């Protein structure tokens, strides 16, 4: 083979490394594997991988109209000075409440608002898009979320409010610093760490109790 | 069965999640699979996994006089405020030149110096400790390094030195800001990012060019 749909050897493409971050390279071969095909990527950053269609993504930003709740995407994550690419699911499309942004639920349970220009469409997602989410607890939340979807139980929080927030099986004293749409920035008082958290997460005590 | 050496059911343990970070939990079972045992971990946070012995670690910091170049460990990784647990290989043990710290080569190719109180020992490492490193470029680097060991080819670098440093397939104009033992802090100029890098890495042009 040399083409499969719009996947064509020598094209630029994004590929998921075994580390779970995604990296730019070139599609150097396509390979038939039984019923379907696999896609061989040579990474700009030196390695090579033979990948299924749901572990590559196009090197362009999608049009924010083909994005729906449940869409499989790769999104930029800004860990301070570095920027990484990581997979997730579109949880919210742009609107007035979220200030015309996309809410992304990443495959490791993190959540963040991003713009169309920080997103890449996965080439061949699965029919049920959450089924290649490796972490089972995250996969299950996504499946419940997308299935209930328009239903989205959240907790009302106000800046300064004192609550307990879960982290690593412990409940910690914390304070609400800020609310941005469906997220809340939480300050943990013991170690002064901050963390953005979906307002429907049971890690927030008022959400834990409501349930 | 409920015992295997000092792996005993109801003990506290660290287990490796499918996201590649490690989390505290409880050993709730031991299961025979093929020729060996797997270990069922219920995580403090949420979730359960049936893990092989090299994907669990003890809850305590190891006796410094038990750690060697090649030891398979879990180390604390500090993103400023956040702390994660991530698997790696001891590349150096404490000495005068490294300010009595352990140098850790993590499984995703990062390197940092840590103290004994930031380490946890993997319960059942492979005979060749690198053989469960998933990223093949990192694996091959660590095999060569551990196999070559007291041989430690590095480049010498001075504060202020201008060099090219690789990042994602591109060589960027950069500067040596700091030397700390076997690591150097590089300032990428085009976009101002700082990054710690092992002085034996071929991402440093002088090393890439060493012959
Ligand atoms: C998306 N994902 C975000 C992770 N960061 C994060 N995950 C959770 C989950 C709950 N809370 C937090 C939280 O606060 N943070 C900061 C870091 C991760 C990463 C993987 C590999 C290389 C660099 C980065 C990428
Ligand atoms: C050890 N590993 C380090 C990664 N960070 C990193 N890796 C490389 C590789 C070359 N250069 C850098 C570099 O500069 N950084 C900052 C982040 C990663 C992580 C995974 C999941 C959740 C939070 C964190 C842990």
Curated annotation (Swiss-Prot), chains A, B:
Q: Which superkingdom does the taxonomy of this entry point to? A: Eukaryota
PTM entry text: Degraded by the proteasome, shielded by interaction with ATF7IP.
Q: Which residues form the Tudor domain?
A: 66-129, 156-211
The transmembrane segments are none
Q: Where does tissue-level expression of this protein occur?
A: Widely expressed. High expression in testis.
Q: Remarks, anything else? A: Highly up-regulated in Huntington disease patients, suggesting that participates in the altered chromatin modulation and transcription dysfunction observed in Huntington disease. Its down-regulation has salubrious effects on patients, suggesting that it may be a promising treatment in Huntington disease patients.
Function, as annotated:
Histone methyltransferase that specifically trimethylates 'Lys-9' of histone H3. H3 'Lys-9' trimethylation represents a specific tag for epigenetic transcriptional repression by recruiting HP1 (CBX1, CBX3 and/or CBX5) proteins to methylated histones. Mainly functions in euchromatin regions, thereby playing a central role in the silencing of euchromatic genes. H3 'Lys-9' trimethylation is coordinated with DNA methylation. Required for HUSH-mediated heterochromatin formation and gene silencing.
Q: Please give the family membership noted in the entry.
A: Belongs to the class V-like SAM-binding methyltransferase superfamily. Histone-lysine methyltransferase family. Suvar3-9 subfamily.
Q: How does it assemble?
A: Part of a complex containing at least CDYL, REST, WIZ, SETDB1, EHMT1 and EHMT2. Forms a complex with ATRX, TRIM28 and ZNF274. Probably part of a corepressor complex containing ZNF304, TRIM28, SETDB1 and DNMT1. Interacts with TRIM28/TIF1B. Interacts with ATF7IP and ATF7IP2; the interaction with ATF7IP protects SETDB1 from proteasomal degradation and is required to stimulate histone methyltransferase activity and facilitate the conversion of dimethylated to trimethylated H3 'Lys-9'. Interacts with CBX1 and CBX5. Interacts with DNMT3A and DNMT3B. Interacts with SUMO2. Interacts with MPHOSPH8.
Share the domain note from the entry.
The pre-SET, SET and post-SET domains are all required for methyltransferase activity. The 347-amino-acid insertion in the SET domain has no effect on the catalytic activity.
**Protein name as it appears in the record:** Histone-lysine N-methyltransferase SETDB1
Question: Which source organism does the UniProt entry give?
Answer: Homo sapiens (Human)
What broad taxonomic lineage does this protein's source fall under? Eukaryota, Metazoa, Chordata, Craniata, Vertebrata
The record's gene field reads SETDB1
Segment of the intact protein contained: 192 to 402 of 1291
């Amino acid at each position: 083979l040399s083409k499969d749909g719009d996947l064509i050897v020598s094209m630029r493409i994004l590929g998921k490394k075994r580390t779970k971050t995604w990296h730019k390279g070139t599609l150097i071969a396509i390979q038939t594997v039984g019923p379907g095909k696999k896609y061989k990527v040579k990474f700009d950053n030196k390695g090579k991988s033979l990948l299924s269609g749901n572990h590559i993504a196009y090197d362009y930003h999608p049009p924010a109209d083909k994005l729906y709740v449940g869409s499989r995407v790769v999104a930029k994550y800004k860990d301070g000075n570095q920027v990484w690419l990581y997979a997730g699911i579109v949880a919210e499309t742009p609107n007035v409440k979220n200030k015309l942004r996309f809410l992304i639920f990443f495959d490791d349970g993190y959540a963040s608002y991003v713009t169309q220009s920080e997103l890449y469409p996965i080439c061949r997602p699965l029919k049920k898009t959450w089924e290649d989410i490796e972490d089972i607890s995250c996969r299950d939340f996504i499946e419940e979320y997308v299935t209930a979807y328009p239903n989205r139980p959240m907790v009302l929080l106000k800046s300064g409010q004192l609550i307990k927030t879960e982290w690593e099986g412990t409940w910690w004293k914390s304070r609400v610093e800020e609310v941005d749409g469906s997220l809340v920035r939480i300050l943990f008082l013991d170690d002064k760490r901050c963390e953005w958290i979906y307002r429907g997460s049971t890690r927030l005590e008022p959400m834990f109790s409501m349930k």
